[PDB]
Amino acid sequence: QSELDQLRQEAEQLKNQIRDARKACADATLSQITNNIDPVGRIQMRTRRTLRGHLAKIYAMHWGTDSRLLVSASQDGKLIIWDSYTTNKVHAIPLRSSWVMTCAYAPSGNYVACGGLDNICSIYNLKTREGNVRVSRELAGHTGYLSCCRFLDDNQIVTSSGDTTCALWDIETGQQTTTFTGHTGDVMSLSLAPDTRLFVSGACDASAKLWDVREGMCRQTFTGHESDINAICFFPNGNAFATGSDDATCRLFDLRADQELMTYSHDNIICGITSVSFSKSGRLLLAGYDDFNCNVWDALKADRAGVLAGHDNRVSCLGVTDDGMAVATGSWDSFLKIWN
Amino acid sequence: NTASIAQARKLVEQLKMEANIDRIKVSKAAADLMAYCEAHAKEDPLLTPVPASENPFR
Amino acid sequence: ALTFITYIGCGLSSIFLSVTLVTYIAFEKIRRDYPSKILIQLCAALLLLNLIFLLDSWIALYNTRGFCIAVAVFLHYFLLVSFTWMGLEAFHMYLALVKVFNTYIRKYILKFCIVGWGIPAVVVSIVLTISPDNYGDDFCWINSNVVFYITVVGYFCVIFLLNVSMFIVVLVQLCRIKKKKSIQDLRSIAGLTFLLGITWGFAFFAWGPVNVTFMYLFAIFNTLQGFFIFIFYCAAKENVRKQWRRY
Amino acid sequence: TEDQRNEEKAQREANKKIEKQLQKDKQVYRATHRLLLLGAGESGKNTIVKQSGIFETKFQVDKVNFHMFDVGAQRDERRKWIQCFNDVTAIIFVVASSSYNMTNRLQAALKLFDSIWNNKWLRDTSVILFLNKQDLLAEKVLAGKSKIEDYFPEFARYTTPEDATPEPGEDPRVTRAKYFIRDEFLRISTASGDGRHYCYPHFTCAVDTENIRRVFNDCRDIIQRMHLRQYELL
Amino acid sequence: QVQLQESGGGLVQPGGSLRLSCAASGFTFSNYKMNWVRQAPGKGLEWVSDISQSGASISYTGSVKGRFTISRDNAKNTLYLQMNSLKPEDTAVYYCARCPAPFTRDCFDVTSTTYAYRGQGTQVTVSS
Fold this sequence. Notes:
The structure holds 5 protein chains of 5 kinds.
Chain A: H1 4-24, H2 30-33, E1 49-51, E2 58-63, E3 69-74, E4 78-83, E5 88-90, E6 100-105, E7 112-116, E8 121-122, E9 146-153, E10 156-161, E11 166-170, E12 176-180, E13 187-192, E14 198-203, E15 208-212, E16 218-222, E17 229-234, E18 240-245, E19 250-254, E20 259-264, E21 273-278, E22 284-289, E23 294-298, E24 304-307, E25 315-320, E26 327-331, E27 336-339
Antiparallel strand pairs in A: 1-27, 2-3, 3-4, 4-5, 6-7, 7-8, 9-10, 10-11, 11-12, 13-14, 14-15, 15-16, 17-18, 18-19, 19-20, 21-22, 22-23, 23-24, 25-26, 26-27
Chain C: H1 5-25, H2 34-55, H3 66-97, H4 109-116, H5 120-129, H6 146-160, H7 165-177, H8 186-195, H9 202-207, H10 214-221, H11 225-233, H12 238-244
Helix pairs in contact in C: 1-2, 1-11, 2-3, 3-5, 3-6, 8-11
Chain D: H1 4-29, E1 34-39, E2 54-60, E3 65-71, E4 90-95, H2 105-117, E5 126-131, H3 174-182, E6 199-203, H4 213-230
Parallel strand pairs in D: 1-3, 1-4, 4-5, 5-6
Antiparallel strand pairs in D: 2-3
Subcellular location (chain D): Cell membrane
EC number (chain D): 3.6.5.-
Organism (chain D): Homo sapiens (Human)
């Protein structure tokens, strides 16, 4: 009676409405609009600091909300809280398993997440009493490697995993409150909205999904890329986000009238993007690459406004402070640079 | 097969949900994407370089 | 005018030794691993030995004692550091190729510059304190027969017998993997003879009642050593050539 | 403004207590020689063994310490998390080598070696390759139950190499089969040369007591070819 | 939307012939190299053939070596597979899979269950 091939045919009818709905609202392109504004000019940054001390390659970093401290996680099995004004060190924390793939700094400055190929997120209470740092909760529910994690407050943390699921956790009870399903491919990154009611997530199918944190569903689905997505980040006002992927492109998507708006590509670039990030105003866009460079694009004109070329191996991570004063990059040569 | 009918049924309920949303015109979306970057222009150190006096790194 | 090729020789190696020394100190992507570091210390000592030697020959005017015995020790000192930096690089290749595991000491290059720049600075003092009257067709050389056998001829053979052994130990192992499952290795093999400094072996031969040209080989090979370290360890590597090109 | 100079000197001594522990941690990281063990799954850790996500077993040969990691509880999409293992010394690859009757488990092992060897970030990592699970009569040519001329259309036109060392008593046509499977590898190895890594084959059996020695004797060759390349000799 | 729609497969007598096809859309066809995989009932996915970027660098498996042939046409985003002298071992559904990244020579997750860049497949049956 053939149930499978008419359910697979109804989805073709349902998808052709969504493509024709987005086509009906495409009254102009973005480069038709912004072709009258003045350019940004060439920019340059000069590597104000350099932070040495890791034994193996660096996979992640995260600034603090006070724009001074930062975390860094490396495959030798360490986790360092640097101070960026004076290049000192606080709290080199040793890990239980060495393959860590992500880290996060809580907005209260009280905890530090990490996780990796051991399928476990860890909490590491910093502002402690009667002792040094210690692991606190050790969340464990996933069946694949842990690829990202971000704090909401000191009791909720949303994690991304390699078993195609996102999840929302409850510290001090340990089990997960909400479990997000729907991807087909390893979820590689995430980013929260500035009001923290929603978050986006891109995976190894060429797709990105908007999720409701409080509800537990998926609102929209964005498909314009061609390979695995490795990075994502929101715009400052929260009404847009930009992705980076293996097809040497970055793209800009708006939430309302779900389609893409801009594509950041160049003919000399044949390498994949490992990180994206925005400036404070949202005019620049800073992407790391696999050919050891770090370009800078104009988010309203799709031009290229500069380059940052200081590392020896590929750039894994990237991040701009909340006041917008500096950019930190990290790479597989185990050094971090601060550019300004 | 009978398990594979489920995610064929689960996918057609998700495509039914995201089709019924209110899309604005794209020209309205880009015009306010530009106007945010126009209002917050001077409060951007990487864009307009703040001097070495109050710069915290040198 | 019979050995005017030595003045143009040491005057040429001192040029490119300074050229290869500024391209290693300025660019941080090359000076990271051990082998590249010992190169900055060896090319430093050869530059000073090549610079002070022509100063001991071109303007070496007859001072009474003071300016003559001053250059007499700072030529003897720099000759002894260059012998013991080559014999240190044959010791690093013993820890790299013969005893492969468990070779990590916590301070490496600072523990070599104590041995390399320091043991010539303590053998020269005990022969200076017993007699400061050790300078002299004048040239302000050793001006003694019995100590020249000790600090020069003795200190060279005990280094040479532990330096040529790591030239055969390396070449045995290179012919065991070339032979397993033929040109453009000669660029690398010719780099090892000047790095380890085997071309001082013509002087072993020259001692016995001179020759006719064999002493002409010793004079031209060892005066262009710093020139030959440039062409094999500064200009042949395109890892270096992608740095000074692009400015 | 000396009120700044109170606590930042306590910050300054908090920097030097950290750096003293990192000196003790560098000394044991620099002498531990990590290895990654991956196979098709059937042989697995039956051979490479000294008598949750990552499993972590360590051992010691000649007062030199090692680490071996077997990956478990991960999915079968390997294009990520395989590039977390690029600064290891070797990748111990185990092949069942008797795949004629369960499918074609032998051809699937060849496609995986072609993806690992040519990857991008694994171009500098040498592979120690064990051809496990001999079974010279059972499911092989000494009994003639299954034919390898039908699974590979070659090997009916192939002869044994000039220098093949048999065991005294070993079947003249099982040594023809044992060296053909090894020669399906080493032509994926000896084609591309720009990566500068190697491939080292071996034959393991039921009695593999010496099998921590052949991994010791060849990780010594891997470090030797790294230091020889520093001097531009290779 | 990356999509790959195979077509042109059905039942035939042994010794007969059949030519499959695939129309690819959603990406630049010239940068990726393609594959063909199959799944006999009860076994699992296995690899059949591949072909590089516009290249005459073609690989086959040992079973279908002397009688199968592949061909791509970059001008129309199409991938073919001409099959001849079919045997009852060739009773499987055949998918068209591409490599995950452009301009690469490795190709990892093709014969994997739950793989993204792969069609739904076409049935090919032989019977006497």
